[PDB]
């Protein structure tokens, strides 16, 4: 099955690299948990960071390991770069592996840890 | 299908907290390659590097995040910790977050993620 996977790629390319936090209530279930990097943040916090950063002149892109993905019944785990550009800055590439897993076709737990760590 | 959790157990249990090397090659294929905080390891370094760590006075626990697990045909990703003992010094927590990729019943590729990172 591929539903999982294509879920996480939309809520990438459409939340994510167009900074669109309006559409964080339409990927993101309402009592979702982000696990990253030894920080647990609940919905509200992830979703008041988020509006906040996509505010700023930041801008995105995602580059995912097409051979490290792993799909079952409403999860999904891969390995991804998100690269960060801001005005005047060198961009940077953070690694990300992450699991996913969905209720209804939203997220409702994350777990990642990056490389360097965003802490 | 609980395949390939089983079998990522059970290197963790008899490879790892067993401190056994010479079980290196039962569970990794001979082409292995881990990717794990930016770096690229192929097969020797690995096993190199192993026998060398599993010849001090270091010890092993693990512990899987039950909820975290993401099963396919051949593929396994999970979140764990490895607590370290070594004498007269205090344990330490590092979480890793990996997906295993496997040929054959051995790990023919992981790529993890660790917090705090080993390097």
Redesign the interface.
Known sequence: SMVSIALLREMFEKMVVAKNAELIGHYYDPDFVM?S??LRQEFAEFNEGHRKIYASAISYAIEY?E??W???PD?????VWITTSRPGEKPTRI?????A?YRDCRIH?I???????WR
């Open positions: 696990y990097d030894g390991d051979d490290a792993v799909q079952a999860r999904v785990a891969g390995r690694e990300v592996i992450l699991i897993a737990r777990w990642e840890t990056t490389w360097p760590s």
